[PDB]
Enzyme design. Structure first.
Site, PDB file in Angstrom:
ATOM      1  N   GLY A  53       5.958   7.480  -0.802  1.00  0.00           N
ATOM      2  CA  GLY A  53       5.805   6.400   0.147  1.00  0.00           C
ATOM      3  C   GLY A  53       6.722   6.508   1.342  1.00  0.00           C
ATOM      4  O   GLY A  53       7.773   7.149   1.284  1.00  0.00           O
ATOM      5  N   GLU A  73       0.749  -1.267   0.000  1.00  0.00           N
ATOM      6  CA  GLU A  73       0.000   0.000   0.000  1.00  0.00           C
ATOM      7  C   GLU A  73       0.779   1.317   0.000  1.00  0.00           C
ATOM      8  O   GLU A  73       0.553   2.175   0.854  1.00  0.00           O
ATOM      9  CB  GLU A  73      -1.015  -0.003   1.152  1.00  0.00           C
ATOM     10  CG  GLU A  73      -2.092  -1.079   1.043  1.00  0.00           C
ATOM     11  CD  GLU A  73      -3.172  -0.747   0.018  1.00  0.00           C
ATOM     12  OE1 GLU A  73      -2.971   0.176  -0.801  1.00  0.00           O
ATOM     13  OE2 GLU A  73      -4.230  -1.410   0.036  1.00  0.00           O
ATOM     14  N   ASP A  74       1.714   1.440  -0.943  1.00  0.00           N
ATOM     15  CA  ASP A  74       2.537   2.640  -1.115  1.00  0.00           C
ATOM     16  C   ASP A  74       3.574   2.867  -0.019  1.00  0.00           C
ATOM     17  O   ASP A  74       4.111   3.958   0.113  1.00  0.00           O
ATOM     18  CB  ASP A  74       1.672   3.895  -1.310  1.00  0.00           C
ATOM     19  CG  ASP A  74       1.150   4.031  -2.730  1.00  0.00           C
ATOM     20  OD1 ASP A  74       1.961   4.001  -3.677  1.00  0.00           O
ATOM     21  OD2 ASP A  74      -0.079   4.169  -2.898  1.00  0.00           O
ATOM     22  N   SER A  75       3.843   1.837   0.769  1.00  0.00           N
ATOM     23  CA  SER A  75       4.872   1.894   1.799  1.00  0.00           C
ATOM     24  C   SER A  75       6.078   1.163   1.236  1.00  0.00           C
ATOM     25  O   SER A  75       5.910   0.190   0.527  1.00  0.00           O
ATOM     26  CB  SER A  75       4.379   1.219   3.078  1.00  0.00           C
ATOM     27  OG  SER A  75       4.020  -0.134   2.843  1.00  0.00           O
ATOM     28  N   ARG A 131      -1.740   3.975 -10.798  1.00  0.00           N
ATOM     29  CA  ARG A 131      -1.002   5.221 -10.732  1.00  0.00           C
ATOM     30  C   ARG A 131      -0.655   5.523 -12.186  1.00  0.00           C
ATOM     31  O   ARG A 131      -0.536   6.685 -12.581  1.00  0.00           O
ATOM     32  CB  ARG A 131       0.281   5.044  -9.932  1.00  0.00           C
ATOM     33  CG  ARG A 131       0.039   4.517  -8.517  1.00  0.00           C
ATOM     34  CD  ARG A 131      -0.483   5.572  -7.560  1.00  0.00           C
ATOM     35  NE  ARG A 131      -0.706   5.023  -6.224  1.00  0.00           N
ATOM     36  CZ  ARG A 131      -1.731   5.347  -5.440  1.00  0.00           C
ATOM     37  NH1 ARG A 131      -2.638   6.221  -5.850  1.00  0.00           N
ATOM     38  NH2 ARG A 131      -1.861   4.782  -4.247  1.00  0.00           N
TER      39      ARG A 131
END
Ligand SMILES: [Zn+2]
Ligand SMILES: [Zn+2]
Ligand SMILES: [Zn+2]
Ligand SMILES: [Zn+2]
Lengths: 112, 51, 1079, 51, 56, 64, 46
Positions: free
Chosen positions: C843, C706-708, C875
């Site tokens: 992130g 999740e974008d981490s 994205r």
């Protein structure tokens, strides 16, 4: 800021054992060993050398959680055979293998 | 003393990575384990630098 | 060739530099403008003449008047302004005007390389900012719908009015009145249709007919002479019929000027020479011309009102101007000088028979620029806030952007219009709130300054220009009419030659390259704009000078030639400045080459008058650093366009000598592996904004979800992404006209006690700390007192800490002790800090592994970063993947990688070059799971990509409170983590809980964990009167005289006040513990 | 610039500034025979995948 | 602003990051924070023993 | 801002290679090759110098 | 021997106290830094 001191991944603190062994009730002759201050480096190595000893009926391991460098190893073997020995031997076998390796690496080396 | 354009801990970092000798590294103990308060020759190696 | 136009661009910035506009517009105010302003409506019932503007000075007590310099004023928090003197006639000091760094009146303007290095001023600093009270203030461009132009708007079915035309008028030079002319048109496109117009001071509106007779034309047909230029246009004429009848009641000039309520008629004239269409000129003998105008307007009107011409495009940028710095200092000044005018009037109205405190012109200017409130000061906030902010200094490209920023006062304006092409960058613009109302200028765009009208007015009325005065619409059929700055200076017959002569005169340079000339053949008209505030871009000239076929005027001789500035590149007719208006009637060619078989891989490509210098010049600072923005979903580029303004790096080099609050420097910078040819002009290579991380887009522990992203600890130790953090607390020793001074010491005891909590032991006797000191918790950073001995010493904010890096004491003009302290701190990336590439792929860290745990490739090579493949599909940002590839080549090949926009490079091409070196043609490599050593059933997109470490690190957000400092008015907690505050539990949070039916818990929040308070109500008059002396039991509650029936309740103190308020508003909230109304 | 350094034992775990390794190659069965991987490709694996 | 919703004590806020080895209903909390927020738990002869460790 | 002792990515030293590099440029006019000869194989250690922006130079022109 | 403050230009070790002016032993330039500590400072390479 909130991260522990690095040296807490290997030094045991005030009265705490490296090893903790617990008996398993789920099935006969089985145990779950809690290893303190360790990782895959030593883990996976023990797991492996157990599927070589056809006397081991089970051998798996796991990392409770990645923040803490520890791991639990559950092993189950045939009737009246203690896992610890097979662990000793195969561990010694590692040393022998390594004793051999060392030696075999020294003669090999010398020829340069 | 440090009149360099770099800050203290900026330099401190640098020197930490520089490779030192480690031949008979196996026969020494951590100053923390050494029964000497803090450190000493029997457990640490001091160096100087003036520029 | 393509690589050539680059040299042309190079030639441009070598001479003009990114901030031309700012300086140019400033100097225009200093040099010229400022004079013209003071000499207009001056003389008072005694004249004024030339004005003197000396250089920077510092009148401080304990010294004469030290000639002050920029780099000082910054540190001592002063004002980079100089004196202004004027020889008044019936020598004098009058206000301090803040100069603009790097301009003309700033000494730096001459000094050369070594010379500057000696002035401590960083060469890379392009300047262009002001230095008020320390912090660098940057004036922000203010957009506004231009004036003096014809428009037309249709007004909705529900309204007595059908359509309307407006025209904003203001003297291009002289006061600049802001009164607009409204020529409405009641009666919708149906109902049984009058025409009325609005004049300044007139109650109701007036019907056009009277306005003609009131001018000096009373009979018909001499009137339609002006309106219609074709007796055979029955349609138009018809509409007018009902209207003539309206004014049929006034048959002459007397009543005409009358009806507007001899005294008024005399006054009527006035309202024609000072109110009626006040621009153009207010002289006298020019009545005729305006009549032709008022005819041309009502014409333009119907031309739309008859569905022949659409409604005027409200957001057609070309009809919008931009009041830069120079212009602003005018409308502001007048308001002041006019109060100054009538101020010197007050001194003369005290003299029952020097004095002029030239600080009101100094402090007035300051107020605005400091806050952002233009319009004076006083009980007059009725100005506009936003103008002038606190120049960003997070990163270089941040600061840059900020100066090149434009605003726009308030669903249609926010749109990205067509007209924005070339002049403004499409991506860079703030998210949420005002988004699109804040535009940044492109690289090639520039604003006008103010050329002269006459040298072209003459040049006209001396080449075929038969004056407007005597016109005959039928005798002169196709007479091409010409407009000058929104004024009609007569028509002209065949213009074709007259045209391509002035424009050639300009190309040699005898009539400023800044003027605009637009010919609208499709209407037979000529627009002439000299104006100050017109955005323009440059284009190549084509010209068919080939008597042997059909070709660009420029040659490879002009190129290699690049006493030859950019001014000559224009003085040779090789480039022209085309504004948004003129654009309308030209045809621009994209690629110079092509626009004068193929590979099934590359991108499919789809009379010429002008060519585009290069498409990648329509971008501003933000997008200019993004590699292949033409491969990502556009809205994403728009994100990075903002996040860029929030990363870390190095924002200047003098930084080691700046005592500014907050500042971050990235330990080890790194210029990107892939770049734009344009970067070459953004000195980016000498001031990078990030580092090249060895990315690896794959799944692993599931902490890159999740974008981490996962960051390799091992290299975080090797100093990867570490950054210094500065801060600068400052204090003074305040006084009073009544000799009572403060002190800078190491206070203790002394009858007062008023001191802090932390420790002072780390304070040497000078009342300061040392640069070695390791500060923490709350430890007092400075030591101050106020004898009235109460401590006023400053303590390090409870949440912070680090190490002192440089302390310094100094005098003040008021001979006070000025002292600033700077604290440094190294910030290491942590399992929470935010990061991002140049593709909106932001992130934060989820965890950190080391070398072993990390996945690796046979070669040995191991990743520094692992982001998740899921952050790619929606994205859509593909260029990222491409930036990676390219950068994976330049790494192995050692050659610098060009990423610039529309060139001749493809993924298939790059892939072959990577196959020539040894590794997979797509990047991908085999990897072995760091834990078991066994290969990964899959392959990974392993490749070096640039990564910026944006600020917003955890330890600056992490906040937790349990009964802390309470607010005063409310008595609830306080706001902000900085003041140890508490989080709000707003409506939406309430609601949810209520849905859960968590009755009690909610009751326990609002009371126990916040407000709460025990009030005593009265059993009779349900009020909070009771005098409850908790000892002698005495309760009472006079006025209703009770002492027996009183009740106790638990309510939020916040509420108690609400009631007192309600009481204080005379409303009576009775509280009953028993129901009385029954049912 | 005047310093004074003190050195100590330690390992790569404690800090990166220690480990003498610095990159280590590891591969096995270059020709995927054990099939502990499934090669990506557009047409021909062998030709598109570098030996 | 202050009545229908107000700022309250015993509250905290920081940066989130997911953990794939934490039960659905859990929530890993930073040491720092745990050392700040309290909970009034009455003394009882069943948890005294545990409390007496925690207090020292 | 000076060269980074040991490369982030793999760990290999890179402090010495600085003067060597800036020379093999000025005279021998190389990039790719110089590096190759400097013993800088794989892109991981590679990118460090070729991406290094020696700011320190301008800083050194400053007084204290 | 011994030092308190130095000057931004005429780097000359000074030393003062209240009312004794806030300038330097030459250069009017009223800057002045507050010179290092005697007790050596220990740093971490992190
Ligand atoms: Zn020791
Ligand atoms: Zn009462
Ligand atoms: Zn490397
Ligand atoms: Zn001095």
């Amino acid at each position: 800021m909130n991260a522990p001191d690095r040296f807490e991944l290997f030094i045991l603190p005030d009265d705490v054992p490296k090893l903790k062994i617990t008996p398993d009730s789920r099935v006969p002759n089985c145990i779950i060993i809690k290893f303190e201050r360790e990782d895959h480096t030593l883990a996976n190595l023990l797991r492996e050398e157990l599927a070589l000893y056809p006397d081991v009926t089970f051998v798996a391991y796991k990392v409770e959680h990645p923040l803490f460098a520890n791991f639990v190893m559950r092993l189950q073997t045939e009737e009246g055979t203690r896992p610890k020995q097979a662990l000793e031997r195969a561990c010694a076998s590692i040393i022998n293998k390594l004793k051999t390796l060392d030696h075999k690496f020294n003669e090999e080396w010398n020829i340069k | 003393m440090n009149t360099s354009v770099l800050a203290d801990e900026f330099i401190s970092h640098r020197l930490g990575l520089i490779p030192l000798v480690s031949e008979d590294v196996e026969e020494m103990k951590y100053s923390r384990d050494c029964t000497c308060e803090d450190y000493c020759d029997e457990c640490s190696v001091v160096l100087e630098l003036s520029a | 060739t393509t690589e050539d136009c680059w040299t042309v661009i190079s030639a441009f910035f070598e001479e003009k530099g990114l901030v031309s506009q700012q300086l140019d517009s400033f100097d225009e105010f200093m040099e010229t403008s400022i004079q013209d302003l003071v000499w207009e409506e001056p003389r008072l019932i005694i004249r004024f003449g030339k004005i003197y503007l000396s250089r920077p000075t510092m009148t401080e007590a304990d010294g004469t008047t030290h000639a002050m310099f920029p780099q000082e004023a910054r540190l001592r928090n002063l004002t980079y302004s100089s004196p202004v003197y004027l020889d008044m006639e019936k020598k004098v000091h009058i206000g301090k005007v803040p100069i603009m760094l790097r301009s003309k009146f700033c000494s730096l303007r001459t000094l050369d390389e070594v010379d500057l290095y000696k002035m401590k001023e960083c060469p890379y600093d392009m300047g262009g900012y002001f230095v008020i009270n320390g912090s660098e203030k940057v004036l922000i461009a203010q957009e506004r719908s231009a004036a003096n132009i014809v428009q037309v708007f249709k007004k909705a079915a529900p309204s007595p009015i059908s359509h309307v035309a407006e025209i904003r008028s203001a003297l291009e030079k002289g006061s600049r009145l802001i009164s607009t002319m409204q020529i409405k048109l009641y009666g919708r496109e149906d109902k049984g249709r009058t025409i009325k117009a609005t004049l300044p001071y007139v109650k109701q509106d007036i019907p056009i007919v009277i306005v003609f007779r009131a001018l000096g034309v009373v009979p018909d047909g001499e009137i339609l002479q002006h309106i219609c230029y074709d007796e055979n246009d029955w349609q138009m004429l018809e509409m007018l019929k009902p209207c003539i009848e309206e004014g049929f009641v006034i048959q002459d000039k007397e009543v005409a000027l009358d009806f507007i309520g001899e005294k008024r008629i005399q006054y009527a004239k006035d309202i024609l020479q000072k109110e009626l269409l006040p621009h153009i000129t207010q002289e006298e003998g020019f009545e005729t011309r305006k009549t032709f105008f008022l005819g041309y307007m009502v014409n333009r009107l119907l031309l739309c009102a008859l569905e022949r011409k659409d409604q005027d495009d409200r957001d057609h940028f070309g009809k919008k101007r931009l009041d830069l710095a120079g212009p602003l200092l005018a409308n502001l000044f007048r308001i002041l000088f006019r109060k100054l005018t009538r101020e010197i009037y007050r001194y003369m109205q005290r003299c029952i028979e020097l004095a002029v405190k030239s600080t009101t012109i100094t402090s007035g200017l300051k107020y605005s620029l400091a806050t952002g409130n233009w319009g004076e000061q006083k009980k007059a906030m009725s100005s506009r806030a936003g103008v002038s902010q606190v120049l960003n200094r997070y990163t270089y490209s941040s600061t840059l952007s900020h100066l090149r920023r434009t605003n726009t006062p308030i669903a249609k304006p926010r749109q990205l219009h067509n007209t924005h092409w070339g002049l403004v960058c499409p991506a860079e613009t703030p998210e949420g709130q005002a988004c699109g109302l804040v535009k940044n200028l492109s690289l090639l765009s520039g604003i006008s300054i103010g050329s002269p009208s006459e040298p072209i007015i003459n040049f006209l009325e001396e080449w075929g220009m038969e004056p407007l005065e005597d016109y005959d619409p039928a005798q002169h059929t196709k007479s091409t009419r010409i407009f000058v700055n929104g004024v009609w200076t007569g028509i002209h017959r065949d213009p074709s030659m007259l045209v391509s002569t002035m424009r050639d005169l300009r190309r040699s340079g005898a009539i400023s390259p800044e003027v605009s000339i637009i010919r609208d053949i499709r209407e037979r008209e000529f627009k002439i704009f000299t104006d100050v505030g017109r955005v323009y871009r440059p284009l190549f000239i084509v010209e068919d000078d080939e008597s042997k076929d059909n070709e660009l005027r420029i040659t490879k001789e002009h190129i290699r030639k690049i006493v030859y500035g950019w001014s000559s590149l224009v003085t040779s007719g090789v480039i022209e400045y085309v504004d948004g208006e003129e654009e309308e009637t030209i045809m621009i060619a994209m690629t110079p080459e092509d626009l004068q078989l193929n590979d099934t891989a590359k991108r499919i490509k789809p009379t010429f008058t002008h060519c585009e210098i290069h498409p990648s010049m329509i971008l501003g600072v933000a997008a200019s650093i993004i590699p292949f923005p033409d491969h990502n979903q556009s809205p994403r580029n728009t994100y990075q366009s903002a996040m860029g303004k929030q990363a870390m790096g190095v924002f200047l080099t003098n930084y080691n000598v700046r005592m500014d609050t907050m500042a971050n420097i990235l330990y080890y910078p790194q210029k990107p592996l892939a770049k734009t040819q344009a970067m070459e002009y953004l000195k980016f290579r000498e001031l990078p904004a990030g580092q090249n991380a060895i990315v690896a887009i794959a799944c692993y522990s599931g902490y890159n979800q999740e974008d981490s992203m996962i960051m390799n600890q091992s290299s975080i130790d090797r100093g990867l992404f570490r950054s210094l953090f500065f801060r600068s607390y400052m204090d003074q020793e305040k006084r009073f006209g009544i000799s009572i001074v403060e002190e800078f010491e190491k206070p203790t005891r002394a009858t007062t006690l008023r001191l802090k909590h932390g420790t002072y032991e780390k304070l040497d006797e000078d009342g300061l700390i040392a640069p070695g000191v390791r500060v923490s918790g709350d430890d007092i950073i400075i030591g101050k007192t106020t004898p009235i001995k109460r401590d006023a010493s400053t303590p390090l904010r409870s949440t912070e800490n680090g190490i002192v890096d440089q302390v310094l004491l100094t005098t003040n003009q008021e001979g006070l002790k000025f002292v600033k302290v700077r604290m440094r701190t190294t910030k290491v990336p942590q399992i929470g800090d935010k990061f991002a590439s140049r593709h909106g792929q932001k992130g934060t860290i989820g965890v950190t592994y080391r070398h072993e745990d990390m996945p690796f490739s046979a070669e040995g090579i191991v990743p520094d970063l692992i982001i998740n493949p899921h952050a790619i599909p929606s994205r859509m940002t593909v260029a990222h993947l491409i930036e990676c590839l390219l950068s994976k080549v330049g790494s192995i090949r050692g050659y610098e990688g060009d990423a610039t926009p529309f060139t001749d490079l493809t993924v298939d091409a790059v892939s072959n070059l990577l196959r020539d070196n040894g590794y997979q043609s797509r990047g991908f490599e085999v990897m072995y799971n760091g834990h078991t050593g066994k290969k990964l059933m899959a392959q990974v997109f392993f490749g070096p990509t640039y990564y910026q470490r944006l600020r917003h690190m955890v330890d600056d957000k992490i906040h937790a409170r349990a009964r802390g400092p309470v607010q005063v008015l409310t008595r609830q907690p306080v706001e902000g983590r900085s003041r140890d505050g508490g989080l709000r539990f707003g409506e939406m949070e309430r609601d949810c809980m209520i849905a859960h039916g968590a009755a009690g818990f909610l009751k326990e929040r609002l009371m126990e964990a916040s407000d709460a308070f025990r009030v005593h109500v009265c059993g009779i008059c349900g009020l909070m009167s009771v005098i409850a002396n908790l000892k002698k039991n005495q309760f009472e509650c006079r006025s209703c005289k009770n002492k027996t029936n009183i009740y106790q309740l638990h309510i939020p103190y916040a509420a108690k006040l609400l009631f007192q308020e309600l009481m204080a508003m005379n409303i009576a909230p009775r509280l009953y513990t028993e129901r009385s109304g029954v049912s | 610039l005047n310093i004074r350094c003190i050195a100590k034992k330690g390992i790569a775990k404690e800090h990166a500034k220690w480990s003498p390794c610095s990159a280590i190659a590891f591969e096995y069965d270059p020709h995927n025979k054990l099939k502990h991987t499934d090669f990506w490709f557009e047409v021909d694996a062998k030709k598109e995948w570098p030996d | 602003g202050n009545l229908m919703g107000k700022r309250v004590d015993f509250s905290a806020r920081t940066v989130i990051s997911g953990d794939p080895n934490l039960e659905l209903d859990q929530v890993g909390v930073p040491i720092s924070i745990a050392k700040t927020l309290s909970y009034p738990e009455t003394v009882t002869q069943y948890n005294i023993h545990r409390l007496t460790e925690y207090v020292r | 801002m000076i060269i980074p002792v040991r490369c982030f990515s793999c760990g290999k030293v890179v402090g010495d290679k600085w003067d060597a590099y800036l020379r093999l440029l000025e005279e021998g006019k190389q990039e790719g090759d110089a590096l190759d000869e400097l013993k800088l194989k794989r892109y991981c250690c590679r990118r460090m110098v070729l991406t290094h922006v020696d700011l320190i130079e301008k800083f050194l022109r400053y007084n204290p | 021997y011994g030092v308190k403050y130095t000057c931004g230009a005429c780097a000359h070790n000074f030393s003062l106290n209240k009312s004794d002016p806030v300038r330097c032993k030459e250069c009017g330039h009223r800057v002045i830094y507050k010179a290092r500590t005697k007790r050596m400072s220990k740093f971490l390479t992190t």
